[PDB]
Structure formats: structure tokens, C-alpha cells
């Protein structure tokens, strides 16, 4: 999953990061409200934010 992130540019890595954070917020709000049975999305999105800003850190020098 990190590969296709690698060929992506810093500019679009930020857009994806924002998209992931909005998804994290949405999933948090479903999960708190009682729906969202697919409870693993939470871990998936945290992990995806992690790799996105790992890549985004290593691009910056």
C-alpha cells in the first residue's frame, strides 16, 4: 500500500491525508453512535494515516 503512495507527490499526499482524517472522523461518529459493525475500519484508517504521514515525512528530506 505504501508503493502507490511513493510515486504520489507531496501535494496529493496532503489531500489524501485530509481525506483519511475525514474518514476517520466519520467512522468514529458511526462507531460511537452504535452502527458501523465493520469495526475494523478504525484500525485500518489509523494505519493508513500512519503510512501516509510516514511517507510525507520522508519526502520532506
Amino acid at each position: 500500500k505504501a508503493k502507490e503512495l511513493r510515486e504520489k507527490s507531496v501535494e496529493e499526499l496532503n489531500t489524501e491525508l485530509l481525506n483519511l482524517l475525514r474518514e476517520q472522523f466519520n467512522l468514529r461518529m458511526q462507531a460511537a453512535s452504535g452502527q458501523l459493525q465493520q469495526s475494523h475500519l478504525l484500525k485500518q484508517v489509523r494505519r493508513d494515516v500512519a503510512r501516509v504521514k510516514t511517507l510525507l515525512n520522508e519526502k520532506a528530506g
Binding site: 485530509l18 482524517l21 472522523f25 468514529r28 461518529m29 460511537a32 453512535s33
Partner: protein, 86 residues
């Protein structure tokens, strides 16, 4: 300006209780769990943006942790102007 990320971080969950309901149907105010370090301003901005509703004022209180292991959390009384939220 408070940037996008902090807003995405400050709202934890909607607090649901008899008080929270009656608050919604009488004072047109919604009660939320927020990040323990969130501010009146941050909660206000976050609600206005992420919920696309208009807010009059925010009142916050930190609920002390009950013996068990409950962590201290902050409860927010968000008073909407006229938009129906949820």
C-alpha cells in the same frame, strides 16, 4: 484560523442521556464528548464546520474520572441557533 486537522480531532462522540435529550428538545442544544483539551473556540468551529450548523455558544465541563479507571473527559453543551442537526 483553527486548521482542519484540529477540528477533525476535537469531537469524540455525541453524549446521549435524559439530560442530553431534554437539552436538545428544550434548549436546542446538543451535548458532546470532546477532546479533553478542546476549547470553547475549537469546539465551536468544529461543530460549525463538520456539522454545517450554526452555533450560539458552547459550555464545557470536565467530568472527573470515576474510581474504576474512567478517564477524565470533557462534556460540551453546544447551543445551536436554529439549524436542526440530528
Amino acid at each position: 484560523m483553527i486548521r482542519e486537522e484540529r477540528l477533525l480531532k476535537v469531537l469524540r462522540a455525541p453524549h446521549v442521556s435524559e439530560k442530553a435529550s431534554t437539552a436538545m428538545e428544550k434548549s436546542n442544544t446538543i451535548v458532546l464528548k470532546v477532546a479533553k483539551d478542546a476549547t470553547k473556540a475549537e469546539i465551536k468551529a468544529a461543530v460549525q464546520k463538520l456539522f454545517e450548523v450554526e452555533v450560539e455558544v458552547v459550555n464545557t465541563l470536565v467530568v472527573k474520572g470515576k474510581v474504576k479507571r474512567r478517564s477524565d473527559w470533557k462534556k460540551a453543551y453546544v447551543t445551536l441557533k436554529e439549524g436542526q442537526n440530528l
